[PDB]
Design a protein around this ligand. Structure first.
Ligand SMILES: Nc1ncnc2c1ncn2[C@@H]1O[C@H](CSCC[C@H](N)C(=O)O)[C@@H](O)[C@H]1O
Ligand SMILES: [Pt+2]
Lengths: 265, 265
């Protein structure tokens, strides 16, 4: 009778909320997609074992083109769950799927889970200070995306931090590293030359948030661009005006160069 | 020798993650604070019952002034948990607590949980479009704060949405309703005449995020200012120019007026 949007979490199958696990356990059919993000600490098998149901994994095309043909029909007679990495509506286009559910006479419910959007708090950067967010997309053929560069500029101008989601091509098993995002940004800097992202820019890297030992590093591009941050997923953050305690955290927890402790108010 | 920062979730006791619950159950001591926020859909008793551990509540002063003499000493020869509503480290001052842990020779680990920062995605507003966030505080004595008004202005000017936390007196359990927030903003608008918040401004109200039956309402200030959104806490959102898909979600899911499909897009 109902359809559930249930977040799975950041890292592994234990990042699902208790509410989500118990509701998922009682659903008749369980669907899921693993293309909007990467849960580096689990497998479909572990998820299925935790929920006690077999999970039918859908592709991007299944969802975007056939959600109402594959999932919605079963919801009219059964309770259906649709699992996704992180929080189901964050940094995805899944919100629109609720409009489809409604237009098909299906009631939907959303069970949240830890999202990378708030997990950025572990970097020590005050979350209220983040401005507009962006995605560093892979160039394809002659098309070279650059809008994310302007986002940084705009936020930096306002003294705000910038959260940069990194691209993912799940079908190819390609997960953009913070390294690759930095390479791409320098290339954009060379083109526009707005003094927005250079070798001297301070950046923060958060890798595998949700794991017990995520990689949290901060430093100048020239120094981190070739550093190994471990397995994906990675997210990149370009901080704006640092508060004293923000810089202190980065130095003490993220191993940032002691120098950044000296802010230029 | 270990301190765990564990998120409690959004609404009730089942909003904690499976990882957070299992880890907490294994801790020798469990602390919590409910000053940054409260879990309006549950009680300390039910949380305590779910964890199976006595939960020691800490006040704002216990944490901010005495964290190192109340919590850290025990973390030296035991596993200790520190529960907070939402996602750990989102509250501005919490990240600093990890620095105190390090200074005490104590290892700390973060276990995430849903935060309103990501949960607001249920409003249909694209997450990348949120700008700087702010808190609406009461005017008191000769003090009349208005910075949150300028935040809205700077965000909306760049087509960005503004997430607005409402004032709360946790200890006294006194919330600021979305209604009062609107009145304050209208009063601030009358003082600054910047044309930021008026009877014609479109707003979104989110209450009881995390529950299976949250209240999601969108409309113009003149129609919602005296509407009943239910029990606190309330979260106010002043969106920027809406995406056609964002406007459609508000209409189909949040009961927004058809008028926004042409006026705010
Ligand atoms: N655990 C994690 N650690 C680091 N980055 C992550 C992450 N999870 C997601 N990301 C970032 O976010 C991108 C996916 S966008 C989808 C985000 C998801 N809906 C959520 O709520 O978290 C990843 O490619 C990466 O750039
Ligand atoms: Pt969309």
């Amino acid at each position: 009778m109902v359809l559930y949007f249930i977040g799975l979490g950041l890292y592994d199958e234990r990042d699902i909320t208790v509410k989500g696990l118990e509701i998922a356990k009682k659903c008749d059919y369980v669907f899921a997609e693993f293309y909007t993000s990467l849960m580096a600490g689990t497998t479909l098998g572990r998820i299925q074992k935790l929920i006690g149901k077999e999970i039918r994994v859908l592709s991007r095309e299944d969802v975007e083109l056939n959600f109402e043909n594959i999932v919605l029909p079963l919801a009219k007679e059964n309770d259906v769950a649709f699992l996704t990495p992180g929080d189901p509506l964050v940094a995805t286009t899944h919100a629109e799927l609720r409009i489809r559910a409604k237009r098909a006479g299906v009631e939907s419910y959303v069970i949240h889970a830890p999202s990378i959007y708030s997990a950025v708090g572990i970097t020590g950067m005050h979350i209220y200070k983040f401005g507009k967010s962006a995605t560093v997309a892979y160039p394809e053929g002659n098309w070279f995306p650059t809008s994310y560069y302007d986002v940084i500029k705009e936020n930096a101008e306002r003294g705000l931090h910038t959260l940069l989601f990194l691209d993912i091509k799940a079908e190819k098993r390609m997960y953009m590293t913070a390294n690759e995002a930095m390479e791409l940004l320098l290339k954009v800097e060379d083109m526009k030359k707005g003094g927005v992202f250079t070798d001297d820019t301070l950046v923060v890297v958060l890798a595998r948030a949700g794991s017990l030992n995520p990689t949290i590093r901060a430093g100048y591009v020239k120094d981190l661009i070739r550093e190994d941050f471990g397995d994906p997923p990675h997210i990149l953050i370009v901080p704006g005006k640092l508060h004293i305690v923000e810089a202190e955290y980065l130095v003490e927890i993220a191993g940032a160069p002691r120098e950044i402790l000296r802010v230029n108010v």
